[PDB]
Structure formats: structure tokens, C-alpha cells
Amino acid sequence: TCPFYKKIPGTGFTVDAFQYGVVEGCTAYFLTHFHSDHYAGLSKHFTFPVYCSEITGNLLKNKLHVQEQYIHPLPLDTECIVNGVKVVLLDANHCPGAVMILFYLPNGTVILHTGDFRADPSMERSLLADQKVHMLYLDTTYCSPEYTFPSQQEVIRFAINTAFEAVTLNPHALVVCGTYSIGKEKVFLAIADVLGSKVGMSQEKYKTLQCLNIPEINSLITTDMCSSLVHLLPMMQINFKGLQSHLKKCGGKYNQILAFRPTGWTHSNKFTRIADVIPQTKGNISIYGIPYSEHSSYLEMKRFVQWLKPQKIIPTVNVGTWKSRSTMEKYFREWKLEAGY
Ligand code: NI
């Protein structure tokens, strides 16, 4: 049964609610982004209207085989009427195709659902600037002050410089990047660009990348692994055993691997600066954990909410424990007392 924090009051609408069967009273199912915890339940047998971005709709059609007649893609930054209710989709600064949804209720209430997002000051000059928001359904993944991490730009600077140094010292090194979902494509695209290489990957991953409207993508990726010195592999294979095995496969074209695991936050963030990050090494294999996040840090979250000044906050992440919920409620009250709303 569908939890309350997935229902939009005063509408027939749900958000990211595909794993509960037919939801009573739902006339339109919104999908914020193509991550498995959010799409869980969709397939070619789904026959209700799905509302989403163009990119998300490309992935629904090609990867999950949802029939075309039930996919309703909306343009971003554009007032649209869905089942008699004005909505707007906004870029969430998460993975490709990810949106926040603004709902203008018939009674005058305005609701923002962030989906998953990485708050940014650029959001303070979207269509959010133009009116008041009563209720915020908030991605609270990293809602605690211990969650610090660098900008995406500093992380990519570290990765490009690390990869370029290693391959210039040893032209026979291979770079490997881990993946298990869409998102974080800048990691492997930026490294391949500095090296003058395409990114090599499986046919299934190539298929997924081809749904993403990334400009000049045919120039950047390939299924011909052997022509490429940046390879993508499943995240599970980014360990010394998995990488040793991969190095066998290239037929002694390569004699060293440098591998990247973009994680979110890890507690090496509470002690180490990005500048100071070092790999784990075994023989001719090194593995770097790099803190590339597509969710808000605590400080970014706090700045967004203190700017928006919502009347009520409904968390959408970490809601399963009383300790989590109490911690998050305490920070919401601090923010409101400090800013004066
Ligand atoms: Ni996500």
C-alpha cells in the first residue's frame, strides 16, 4: 500500500509510486527519474498514464518497453495542464532526465516535490522565484551536518588530472570506471576527453546512454572495447579480483589499471580533503573512491530551504526510523528560527 508522502493531496496524482499495484483514486502517475527505487513496478504491461521528462520517457520505452500510448513526456520550464491541474517540471540537478514537479492546486495551495536533487543557487532563478510554496516534499538523503563533500567540478578536476598523469607516465595503462545506474556520466566522459579516447562499454550500457540526449554522444562512446582505453564496468566488478580478471581479457594490450568508484559520501569525507585522496593498491591495480554526489550536501539543502521558506516540509528519504525523523525535524526548526519564516 502506497505511503502518504507519495500522494499529492487535492489531486488524483502520485509520485514515484509504481510498486503498490493500482493505487485507489490515482488518475496520473508521475515519475521524477529513471532510478530503480523510483520506477520499481513499471513494465510493458503498465496501462495507466505516466508523466515524465523526454529523457525519462526514452528510457521507459527502450529499456522497460512501456508502450508509447501510455508515455506522456513534458517539456521543462513550461506550464502544462494535466487532468485539470497546472504543473511545471524543473531540472533537479540529479541524473539525466531527473525533474522536480511544481503542482498548482485548484484551491490555491502550491506544492514542490523535489524528487531526488542536488540543490544549487541557480534554482533560486527558475520559475520558483515567481510565487510562494506552501508544502515541500524534500530529498533528505544527506540531512545531517556531517555530510560534507566537494563540488562536482573539484571532483572532476581531481579525476582528469589523476588519469592524465597516470597514462602519460604509462601509455600501456587502462582506466576503468564503475557504474550501476544512469547518473555521474561526467566522470567517464571527462576522463576519456582528456585522454583522446572513446569510452568502451557493453551493448546494454551503450543502449542506455543512447536514450539520454547527450550532444555528440556518437563521438564519445563505443561498444568496441579494444579500441578504447577508458572502460566502463558494473560497480560490483570494481575490486582487485574483478579487475585482475578484466586485465586478462584485453590480451596483454595493457599492464596496469587505474579504476574509479564514484560513491556518494563515505566517512573518509570527515577527515580527508579531495586534494589528499589516495587509492587502494595491489600490484599493478589501483582503486580510487571519489565523492561525486548527485544529492544535496547538508549546507546546500539548508540554503535552498531557507531561501524557499516553505510552510510545511515532508521528507521523502530516511523516513523509516524514529531517530531519523526526529533528527530531521530538529534541523527544520533550527533553519526556520535562524531565517525567521
Ligand atoms: Ni535517484
The pairing of strands 230-234 and 312-315 is: unpaired
CB 97, CB 121: distance < 8 Å: no
Q: For the chain, what are the domain ranges?
A: 1-147+296-341, 148-295
* Solved using: X-ray
- Residue 301 Cα, ligand 1 centroid: separation in angstroms? 16
1-147+296-341 in CATH: which number? 3.60.15.10
Distance 337 CA to ligand 1 centre (A): 30
CA 186, 187, 188: angle at the middle one, nearest 5?
A: 95
**Assigned C-alpha cell, 184:** 555521474
Q: Please name which of 311, 339, 239 lies closest in space to residue 279, comparing C-alpha atoms.
A: 239
- Rounding to the nearest 10 degrees, give the CA dihedral for residues 208, 214, 219, 222: -10
Contacts of residues 85-91 at CB distance under 8 Å and 24 or more positions apart, as own/partner, are 85/11, 85/13, 87/51, 88/127, 89/53, 90/123, 90/126, 90/127, 90/128, 91/126
Across the strands, what pairs with 72? 51
d(CA 174, CA 254): 6
Burial class (CB in 10 A: 0-12, 13-18, 19+), 25: exposed
Distance of CA 251 to the CA centre of its chain: 35
Angle ∠(145,138,8) on CA atoms, nearest 5: 165
CA distances (Å), 28 to each of 33, 52, 64, 174, 241, in order? 16, 11, 19, 47, 46
Helix, strand, coil abundance in the chain, percent, nearest 5? 35, 20, 45
What separation in Å is there between the alpha carbon of 155 and the centre of ligand 1?
A: 19
3-state secondary structure of 177: strand
The span from the CA of 317 to the CA of 334, in Å, is 19
The C-alpha cell at 212 is 539520454
Domain 148-295 has CATH 3.40.50.920: no
Resolution of the entry in angstroms: 1.5
Q: Residues whose CB is under 5 A from ligand 1 (ion)?
A: 35, 116
Contacts of 47 (CB under 8 A, 6+ apart): 67, 70
Q: How far is the CA of 169 from the centre of ligand 1 (A)?
A: 37
Ligand 1 centroid distance, CA of 76 (Å): 18
**Cα 116 to middle of ligand 1, angstroms:** 5
Report whether 298 contacts 143 (CB < 8 A): yes
Distance 63 CA to ligand 1 centre (A): 17
Which residues is the chain interrupted after (C–N above 2.5 Å)?
Answer: none
Q: Which amino acid is at 310?
A: P
CA 116 to chain centre: 7
Distances (CA, A) of 36 to 26, 131, 181, 321: 21, 33, 8, 22
